[PDB]
């Protein structure tokens, strides 16, 4: 009653089998075993980096193929192994599932076994590494960026082909904080990834529960990584967790790749290199930080037709394969002053730095003022958030610089008192809170009150709820066509007429 189909598969597979080998074939004999570093004295004239499986489900690769013995790679348990199990002949190396068919489920370190199913097949079990794109065929497409922040949606956006080095501050928050991109963006429609570097039960349960229950679940991949990994899963998360991203960026669709913190990636591989007597330099790492960041941070680029016309083997040559480089990192209270931070942050396009002073004090402003900036800016988004919503440096620098120096120099005039109400009311009332979804209504509401003069009449903190709720609900409910203005660019007769009539009637009729 419980077997049914198990008798046919078990009887057919157990009765068919194949043959008997292991005759006149050197499968490699291990000399010693120093808990991981197994000196395999045999089968040294093979491929450079052949992950041959030994006794069990492992992947022992040749770390240093010399003229005699070669070291093996530890893939799981290696402390209980002795010197007598030898190895096995295997020519497979880097056999992971690459394709857009499994982009959406909970992936693992080497596959998709972290979810409840486990049978999430892709297009082809190829390699997990990724290379750079075309040199002259890297045409970046200026598209709109709408994450979840009401103040960062028009300040500095990054569409496709941009590399913004995000620096998340510790103590609320770097792992979450502004995690409203999947719930606010609804269906992304791209092959985005989410490589982790040391997760637990609260991160996988809260992220898997809040991600699937608050937003779209099957829309982006998520490479999970436990904290008990050595260097084949923790240090190879950014270099091996970019397979699905190579399935849409090289064909003609959109793809993305996001990693976790840079502490486990740069610190996980430093123990295997320094513990095996190899090369060292900056934080127990020689030239491994410059070679790994070139094929990961500078590899996610928006291809055009020449770079995708030959890599797709005849498919979508007319489309442009876009790829967003979402390289984020968790800075430990501004811990970014090494060779990997300056070379990786300076070798890319943008570098957004966020401090914990404005977010760890009770305010809703997570990003710092003037320290977080991208490379494309607000001109790569829509027309309403380029020439009508792009003055964070004037209000932040004028309000912070003109309002911060009021201790010994008091008696403010008309030029200093006007920046405190507009800067404090607009910066304190226009900032998004924790886990707050932001749609495409930030350009219509931000390009009207902070441009014409609708926010100057209600600069008080107590009038923001009644004025914002009454004006937003009355203006948004009394006119459904204004939302159509958020479907494209704008900045014309419909923006001035709808913003002036909706702002004057909604602000004057409240």
């Amino acid at each position: 009653q419980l077997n049914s189909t198990e008798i046919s598969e078990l009887i057919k597979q157990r009765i068919a089998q194949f043959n008997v080998v292991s005759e006149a074939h050197n499968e490699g004999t291990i000399v010693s075993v120093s808990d991981g570093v197994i000196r395999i004295h045999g089968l040294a004239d093979a491929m450079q980096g052949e992950m041959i499986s030994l006794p069990g489900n492992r992947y022992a690769i040749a770390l240093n193929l010399e003229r005699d013995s070669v070291g093996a790679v530890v893939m799981g348990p290696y402390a209980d192994l002795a010197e007598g199990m030898k190895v096995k002949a295997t020519g497979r190396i880097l056999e992971v599932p690459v394709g857009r068919g499994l982009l959406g489920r909970v992936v693992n370190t080497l596959g998709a076994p972290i979810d409840g199913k486990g049978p999430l097949d892709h297009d082809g079990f190829s390699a997990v590494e990724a290379i750079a794109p075309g040199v002259i065929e890297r045409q970046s497409v200026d598209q709109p960026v709408q994450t979840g922040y009401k103040a960062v949606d028009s300040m500095i956006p990054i569409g496709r082909g941009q590399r913004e080095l995000i620096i998340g501050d510790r103590q609320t928050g770097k792992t979450a904080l502004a995690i409203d991109a999947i719930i606010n963006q609804r269906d992304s429609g791209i092959k985005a990834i989410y490589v982790a570097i040391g997760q637990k039960a609260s991160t996988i349960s809260n992220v898997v529960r809040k991600l699937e229950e608050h937003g779209a679940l099957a829309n982006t991949i998520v490479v999970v990584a436990t904290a008990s990994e050595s260097a084949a899963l923790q240090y190879l998360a950014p270099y091996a967790g970019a397979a699905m991203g190579e399935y849409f960026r090289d064909r003609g669709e959109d793809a993305l790749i996001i990693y976790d913190d840079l502490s486990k990636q740069a610190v996980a591989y430093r123990q295997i290199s320094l513990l095996l007597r190899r090369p060292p330099g900056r934080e127990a790492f020689p030239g491994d930080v410059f070679y790994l960041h070139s094929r990961l941070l500078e590899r996610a680029a928006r291809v055009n037709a020449e770079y995708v016309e030959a890599f797709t083997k005849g498919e979508v040559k007319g489309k442009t394969g876009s790829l967003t480089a979402l390289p984020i990192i968790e800075t430990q209270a501004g811990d970014v002053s090494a060779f990997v931070p300056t070379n990786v942050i300076s070798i890319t396009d943008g570098q957004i730095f966020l401090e914990t002073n404005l977010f760890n004090a009770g305010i809703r402003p997570a990003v710092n003022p003037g320290i977080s900036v991208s490379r494309v800016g607000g001109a790569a988004q829509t027309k309403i958030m380029k020439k009508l919503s792009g003055g964070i440096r004037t209000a932040l620098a004028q309000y912070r610089e003109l309002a911060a120096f009021s201790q010994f120099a008091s008696d403010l005039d008309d030029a200093t008192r006007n920046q405190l109400d507009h800067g404090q009311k607009v910066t304190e009332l226009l900032k998004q809170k924790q886990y707050a979804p932001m749609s495409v209504a930030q350009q219509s509401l931000v390009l009207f009150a902070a441009e014409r003069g609708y926010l100057a009449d209600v600069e008080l903190s107590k009038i923001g709820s009644f004025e914002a709720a009454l004006l937003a609900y009355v203006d948004r409910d009394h006119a459904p066509l204004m939302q159509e203005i958020n479907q494209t660019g704008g900045y014309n007769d419909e923006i001035e007429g709808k913003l002036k009539g909706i702002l004057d009637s909604f602000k004057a009729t409240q």
């Binding site: 010693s32 075993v33 120093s34 808990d35 402390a79 209980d80 192994l81 002795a82 010197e83 007598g84 510790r170 103590q171 040391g198 637990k200 039960a201 609260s202 996988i204 349960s205 436990t226 904290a227 008990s228 610190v267 430093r270 123990q271 320094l274 513990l275 127990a284 886990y435």
Partner: protein, 466 residues
Amino acid sequence: HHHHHGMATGKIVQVIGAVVDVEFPQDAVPRVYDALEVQNGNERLVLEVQQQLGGGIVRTIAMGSSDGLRRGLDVKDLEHPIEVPVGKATLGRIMNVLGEPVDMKGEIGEEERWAIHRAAPSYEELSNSQELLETGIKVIDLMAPFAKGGKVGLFGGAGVGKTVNMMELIRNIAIEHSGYSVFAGVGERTREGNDFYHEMTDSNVIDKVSLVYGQMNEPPGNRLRVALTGLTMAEKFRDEGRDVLLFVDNIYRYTLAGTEVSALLGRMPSAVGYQPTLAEEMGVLQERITSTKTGSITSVQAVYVPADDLTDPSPATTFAHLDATVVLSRQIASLGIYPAVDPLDSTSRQLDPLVVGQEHYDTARGVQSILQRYQELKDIIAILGMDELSEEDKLVVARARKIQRFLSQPFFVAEVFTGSPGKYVSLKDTIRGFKGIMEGEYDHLPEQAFYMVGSIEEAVEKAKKL
């Protein structure tokens, strides 16, 4: 590991201190960390062989110092595992570090043949959930809730109320929740052993509690090897049906003993003295500060961090793992109080509106608004003039003072510690006595009727006797 003898014998070529050139027979060793119980001189020393280069000639190290034997010691390993004496009925006695008598009393009451089986709960259990049981208190139980078996890492200096934690936590972790408890005795001396043994044995912190031991006189391996015996002896009582309680020593013993032992031995040293492998064990802490499928190992950590700190490297990981903060000073007990616990400096981390609610989140707004408004309004008017007292400043010296300062109560089983024993409070006394009586409910309410009350609900109902 290796228990206990056999596998022919051996012959030591070079004899040194700890890490010596041990060499057994041809292919006669076991797995990693095989404690070969061999007669090294007089007593049966157990040298754990961490390396496994070849067969026999491996780097072996004992728990102490093996310097004294001649060049020709017979080192013989075994084939089975070293089953330490642990179980579920070990609470109530005084166990040693290896499984014997601590203060010349009873050893392990249960022998489940625990071969260093570190129990760790995965994702197929009750992870995660919140506990928030009785204690009994009001601001300490509602303003600082704990998870289901989480590691509540506290932080405090000298004179932060040592009798309130052991006296107030000795009855709630042995009669309210689960009867099986344990205590860590590593890193003790004359004042720690006499004060902890006399204070813990003269009240209700000995039975039933498996008191461990461990002295740091020899090497740091025996005094710092509390992962197998601690994680396999104190957490083994949670499989009987209820939960399990345990204690901790200090946070500096793991970094100092691990870095000094791993850096002063020669091998395993490449991170400028720091151990990059043992720190990986910290990654398993998330598997020990949660509820399992059979119980919940409530490992109550001590008030120790990076050289007595509250916001440093080791102090930030202990406060973020729980649902509250960690701050304890002499300012709360310096103004005449019973329980030395800060209420305004130790706020709850999960005091939002999504993982709480109206009744659950209403206690944080009254304590935070009444403490900040009462302290700022009382300090501003008291540090200047009495003519600037409106309603919050003139009314926060009766309702907010007694309601916000009524948390200093006695323990639940203080029959020979604080004199009178306090009653068991729940969660309704803090919300019902602090969510309405802290701003102005009974009008006239002095601090004399709420100075010895065990709950806040009696701070407004029993105000007729003052």
